[PDB]
Amino acid sequence: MLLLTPGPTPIPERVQKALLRPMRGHLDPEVLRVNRAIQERLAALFDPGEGALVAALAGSGSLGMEAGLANLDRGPVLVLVNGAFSQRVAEMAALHGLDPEVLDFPPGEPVDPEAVARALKRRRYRMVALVHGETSTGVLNPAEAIGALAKEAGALFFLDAVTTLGMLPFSMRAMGVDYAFTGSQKCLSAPPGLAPIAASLEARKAFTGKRGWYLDLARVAEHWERGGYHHTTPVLLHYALLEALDLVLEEGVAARERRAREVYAWVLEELKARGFRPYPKASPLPTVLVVRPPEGVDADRLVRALYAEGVAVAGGIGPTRGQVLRLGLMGEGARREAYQAFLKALDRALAL
Template structure:
């Protein structure tokens, strides 16, 4: 097996995404110690930038966990749930059900609000279950099905209940509107390799003052030492040792996050929507259709497309892989039924999807896909570089 780098691989998956050039460059920095003053200065900049990305209030505790987004998920339950707590989990896909499993492992009495795959959680179903719960947990954008859940409406309901609100922002933060302070979100997390196009291995988190107060009022020790909020605050705020952080990943995340903020979150949201519309317009005549029927419930950063009848899902994806193009199929019950096309970070650009259209022209014998895609993106009057 060759270990030569693949310079031209086209990565169209719902994560990881291609690394931003500024993050790639940051990985080449010489190593510094995790207790170095320069690293602490870098961390302070990261914290401030995360507050801006999440729409968090001044002074909100932000940090990077040394793990992927699943560690961000687990840390919320480990720190904010005690045995016997009532936790309401909204589950309409694989990651909502993962939340329920994690909450249960930390001793929660889990209540579920569900919706069929391809449909959003209904706020009225949440309202009916709110009584007596200490936490509500919601996936903002369900990666497994391409559904955008109505976070602002659910957050408004939760605010009046006294419960904490934990939000999985893995496919939204950094690419879609996220207003932590205004909506009343208490704990949010994402993964570096998603909308920010940084290398995998970090989970940016934000913790409200209300959540920290709940943490400090715990009656039992946090069972997950590695991501204990107290230990994290020792390192990130008091600059004392807790564990060795992946310094070079911090530099890469910092570069990618700055690139996102420099570009502007509204601009990033616009290009994801633009490319998504162009993909759908190009592939619809072949029989591809949106898996999520209601347009308002479609997740702009993960386009879930129902495959045409008789479409050779595994065969076509394998043929694309031979051509250095990676496309992701369905997960669990949607395997063989849908494709999930990533539109996060550096993937949400026309060039990689034009490469997909050229490959599909060859594999499906459908000429003109690339030209149709170009027209959908740029308009008939624009000249598109070859």
């Protein structure tokens, strides 16, 4: 089953094999040093700035998302929405009483900085939340510009980097980000179960909220910074993430962005040749190709057909449920060979 879902992603033998290494306690100095190494690799990708909290939470990307909200002392929070996942952010903010304010943009269209700027003048915000690459629509948002605006309005900048960290240009310092996170199974090509996070110094000062125990970043810091006991960690996953991080760094994000952009380009031409149409109206996300099937072809049915043909892709989600095919070009998904196989399966699927 070729894995072309825009998360989880294919795992390199080298990484998955790391899960075979001898099991150890979560407080074993060796594991503590493995955790130290992980922080250093993640810092090279995150570029978080001194005094920042860098860790890998024991959960999926969503845990990382909620941790960046549940610990916030207060709202209001300007949630920039243009997709299913920024919608999830607003959903979590509301749940936690951060009195979120939604600034909506049409699915398939990028968030507009000019619009953001005007919204920031209307009220004072403690935090502004954005999703770097909106997986549900295949849209890349202008985070660097947004971050500059947030800093001007004196608001913390929360950024979902699931579809970008490890594959596209990323830097918290450069984008003025106060909180970033991803999942171990995204562009990092590691097995799912961990959620790398990064909280700047200013984020930590504002993170005095106490609404959850498991996701309390203060408790998390005690283990990741001081080696104290918070809760038992998925040690084996830690092994795999460290190995996965070395792999990413050996290649370098520049080369990884090229892989994605190149394949994205010809796959779209191949799909347009077959009647498909790109979903994003502008500012496409290189790591996730989202397309509408040919007229008269049911997207979800096509996903089921592709599965039967040996290839797993994703259907739409949130605003695009039942309307598209979402193709992963994150990590090992972004491979010429993988997509040539996908096209063979697609043709078999379309013939039925």
